[PDB]
Amino acid sequence: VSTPELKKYMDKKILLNINGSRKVAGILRGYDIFLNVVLDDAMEINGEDPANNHQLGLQTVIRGNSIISLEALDA
Amino acid sequence: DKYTALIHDENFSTLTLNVSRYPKSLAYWEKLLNYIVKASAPICKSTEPQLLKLIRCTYSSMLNEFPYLENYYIDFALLEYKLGNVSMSHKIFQRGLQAFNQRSLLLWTSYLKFCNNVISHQKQLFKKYETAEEY
Amino acid sequence: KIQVAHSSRLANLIDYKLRVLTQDGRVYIGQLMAFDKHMNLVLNECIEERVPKTQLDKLRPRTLNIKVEKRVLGLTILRGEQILSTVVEDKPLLSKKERLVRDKKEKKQAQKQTKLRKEKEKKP
Amino acid sequence: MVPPINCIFNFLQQQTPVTIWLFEQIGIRIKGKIVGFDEFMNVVIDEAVEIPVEKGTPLGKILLKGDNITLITS
Amino acid sequence: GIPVKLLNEAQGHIVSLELTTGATYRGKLVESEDSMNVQLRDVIATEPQGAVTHMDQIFVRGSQIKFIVVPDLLKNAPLFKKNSSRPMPPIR
Amino acid sequence: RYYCEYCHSYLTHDTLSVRKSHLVGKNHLRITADYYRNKARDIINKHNHKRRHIGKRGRKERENSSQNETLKVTCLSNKEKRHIMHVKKMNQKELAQTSIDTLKLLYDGSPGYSKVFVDANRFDIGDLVKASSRSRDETCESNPFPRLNNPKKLEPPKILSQWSNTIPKTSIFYSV
Amino acid sequence: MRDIVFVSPQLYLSSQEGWKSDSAKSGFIPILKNDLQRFQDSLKHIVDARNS
Amino acid sequence: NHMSQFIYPVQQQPSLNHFTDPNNTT
RNA sequence: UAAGAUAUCAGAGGAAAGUCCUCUGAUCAAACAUGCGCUUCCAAUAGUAGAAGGACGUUAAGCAUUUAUCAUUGAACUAGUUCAUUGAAGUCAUUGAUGCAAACUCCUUGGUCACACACGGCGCGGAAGGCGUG
């Protein structure tokens, strides 16, 4: 029905938790009414900060049925 | 990046070298800190770890020269609070209260205010106040 | 204990201290105040009650006593997706006669406000 | 702004190979070229391969259902 | 529906959450929409195994909320008045 | 249609933004501020008038309380009680708005006072108050020696009016 | 760390061991790696008073 | 709501003799 | 977010098929009354009590248990163990958490009604239902 208002968030670095355990940080470009979201320069965070962390791709789009939370780690 | 652009700045090299020349003067420790925070002005989880680890060793080395500065133990926890690891915020009230030998008012006041929000356990939160009042 | 009206839906039993079950095996016990199309509900002074993992061997088939660890949380708004069933616990503090009395005095008082507002809006 | 349905479409025409992480229960990642999509974010993948989580078999032309789409990644 | 209309009544007051993953957020609630999704500001976030942190700003898909705890003084806001007397509407 | 039941009025032109212009309108804010101020006092002012359950007294206690003398009660006049409830209500308003902040007054010239007590510019709260001067740059170069005709004496400890005549009449030493 | 070193004057003017360490040790002041010589030059007079 | 809860205490002086001068040294 | 609707069924009637509308039946529902030898409940004073529910109260550091990081480099060592240094993350707690049990204190509730101290009903209420007629 209504579009989720993340208008203030876009172009900032954003951590979000995919389903349960996986955490994905990137720079948020765009969003839609289902909360499927797309972001640039993604990186999958893990327990060891430089070691297990690996980059995903140039552009990646996430389905909104696996967003739980979406914290804005910038201003 | 923001870190290396601060090292190659002139004012960092003079303000540091001033402190290593005249340790106990404080007003150079205070300028070394008041400058280095403003140079990382957005101080959120965003900003890079080399710039935060450096701003952590300024504080923690500065309190090791002047253990009786009540406000800089508060101000160092709140920076560790906003950056978002309350484990490391407690640890540096514990190190602040032990500096005064458990009996300073401003620390126990501005510890408990914080401690209300993060303890989230009944019997233990009142145990902080029982231990507080006997000192 | 309490005998609920044999044909009483969720709309009827406002103020009845309910006993709502979620999917995880946690129960919220409080006074109901609203509900909805998809059955999410507002309790007034609810308490979540959980059987901890350690106690749960005791409920396996063989007077049993269960240490139920509960935590207060006043005035929640639950979600529908999570509810599994409901059961009635207590009946409301006010009578059935007295809940009609408080309706008719409030129905009278609500009408008096509009006519005192309409004539204060009409001339001024 | 760059909407997602807009940005799924910029893997269709560009012919870039993508990797698609599924629901964590199943335990495979699919990869290959995204040919075309519907309104319900269920897509057809050309020259597809099923990697368990690099010895997995090739599938062919696969229509993937949009319940199981978690990520779509280049 | 009143359950959702109440959540709009609680803007700019401290609330709690409990996401179906088993976390517990509690900070001041800035925004809410009709699907029970919320933006909280200045929060304290408790991971399901007890670990607590602080984060400045957070958004949550409404679908994952298990309950919200609201301040107790809204228990007598006027959503809950049974017999209400609305005036006659102005003509469009 | 849509309406705001604090104001009791319907919206003239229904859009989403006209709602938001009413939702953060000055008239509407003053209503909802005033609406909860009334419900606040009404739970306290309408005190729980409990229901009594009188037991038939014993033969034993009726004889032991008869030998005990009847105490005098004190009832004030209607004019008297209307004033004494005006006072006691205005007293409980005062204990709300005390907020004993001597401790902020004591650490005024200290070396981190800008960073902890000014509270526009902390870390925890500081980002939130800038949305809704004495800056953070202040160091201990300005005002080196506090006592240079600058500082004010500590304001003396307050005392109860009712019992203002329990105080010892004379000081021990001669003040200036 | 990189381009930074931790030095304390109290261990250097008394001429003791471990007066610099590159790791974040306790009670040491972080100066730039290039400025360690400009550090030592300033304390030379006081080291001459300690020596003689 | 005319009177107040608290006042600062007022107090009488002790007349300034040699025994109650706070500056005295001799 | 929108559109549509305001019990169902069957019969007779008005403008071969169906719709629209009206009175007559059945069934269904709500509100209101009103009954049932209907069901359950409604606390000492001839005594200092007791029933239901609590305590996010005490005893109590009770008693009985089990828990307090990982990686890299050197020394000794049996053929795992300790010490020191370098990096990584790190809810608080160990007077804890988990299991067992008791005692005490205190809180909210009610007909603390009337008649009687008398070898398996048919006092006047109130509360909660079930069932039946109008």
Domain segments of chain E as ranges: 1-92
Task: Report CA(C15)–C1'(I30) in Å, whole number.
Answer: 22
Q: Which of A68, A24, A42 is nearest to D18 (CA)?
A: A42
Q: Degrees (nearest 5) of the Cα angle G11, G13, G18?
A: 30
In 3D space, the residue among C38, C33, C44 whose CA is nearest the CA of residue C11 turns out to be C33
Residues whose CB is less than 8 angstroms from the CB of residue D49 and which lie 6 or more positions away in sequence, other chains included: D30, D31, D32, D56, D57, D58, D59
Distance CA G25, CA G19 (A): 10
Burial of C32 (0-12, 13-18, 19+ CB in 10 A): buried
Centre a 10 Å sphere on the Cβ of residue E38 and count the other Cβ atoms it contains. 24
Q: What is the CATH number of the domain that holds A59?
A: 2.30.30.100
DSSP A74: -
Cα D5 to chain centroid, rounded: 14
Return d(Cα D66, Cα D8) in angstroms, integer.
13
Nucleotides of I under 7 A from a protein CB: 1, 30, 32, 43-48, 55-57, 85-101, 109-114, 126-131
Residues C69 and C118 in one domain: no
> What's the rounded Cα separation, in Å, for the pair D28 and D17?
17
| Count of CB atoms situated within 10 Å of the CB of F88 | 9
Distance CA E26, CA E45 (A): 7
Q: How far apart are CA E30 and CA C90, in angstroms?
A: 36
Phi-psi region of G32 (alpha: psi -120 to 50; beta: other; left: phi over 0): beta
Name the phi and psi angles at C14, rounded to 5: -80, 145
List the beta bridge partners of residue C86.
Answer: C20
Cβ–Cβ < 8 Å for E79, C79 = no
Residue G29 lies in a domain: yes
Pairing of strands C83-88, C76-78: unpaired
* Domains, chain D, ordered by start: 1-74 (2.30.30.100)
Same domain, C101 and C52: no
Mark yes or no for CB contact A61/D71 under 8 Å.
yes
The reply to whether C68 and C111 lie within a common domain is no
Count of the separate structural domains present in chain G: 1
3-class secondary structure, B97: helix
Q: Which of H17, G6, G46 is nearest to F172 (CA)?
A: H17
The answer as to whether G15 is a domain residue is yes
| Number of structural domains in chain A | 1
Distance from CA of G52 to the nearest CA of B (A): 21
Q: Are A72 and E57 in contact (CB under 8 A)?
A: yes
Q: Are F2 and F19 in contact (CB under 8 A)?
A: yes
Spatial separation of the C-alpha atoms in residues E25 and E40, rounded to whole Å = 9
Q: Which residues of H1-26 are buried (b: 16+ CB within 10 A; e: fewer)?
A: eeeebeeeeeeeebeeeeeeeeeeee
- Identify the DSSP state of F48: -
Q: What number of CA atoms fall less than 13 Å from residue H17's CA on the CB side? A: 4
Alpha helices (H) in chain F, listed in sequence order: 16-23, 26-45, 59-64, 78-96, 102-106, 113-116, 126-129
Strand partners, D37: D43
How determined? cryo-EM
Query: Is F115 strand, coil or helix?
Result: helix
CA distances from E43 to A22, B75, B113, E15 (A): 22, 19, 16, 10
Please give the tally of structural domains in chain C: 2
- Non-local CB neighbours of B38 within 8 Å, separated by 6+ positions: none
**Residues C9 and C52 occupy one common structural domain:** yes
Give me the domain span that covers residue C68. 1-91
Helix (H) or strand (E) holding B54: helix B49-62
This structure's resolution (Å) is: 3.6
Interchain proximity E89–F39, CB inside 8 Å:
no
F117 CB-near residues (< 8 Å, 6+ apart): F104, F107
Based on the fold, state whether residues C80 and C109 are members of the same structural domain. Answer: no
Phi/psi of residue C32, nearest 5 degrees:
-75, 145
Termini Cα distance of chain B: 48
Do C86 and C109 fall within a single domain? no
- How close A71 comes to chain B (CA, Å)? 11
In angstroms, rounded to a whole number, what is the distance separating the alpha carbons of residues G50 and G41? 15
F143 and chain B in contact, CB less than 8 A: no
Instruction: Tell whether A23 is within 8 A of chain B (Cβ).
Output: no
Token pair of B100 as six digits: 């005064």
Domain that holds residue G31: 2-43
Breaks (C-N over 2.5 A) in chain C follow: 62
CATH fold for the domain made of E1-92: SH3 type barrels. (2.30.30)
For residue G32, is it within any domain?
Answer: yes
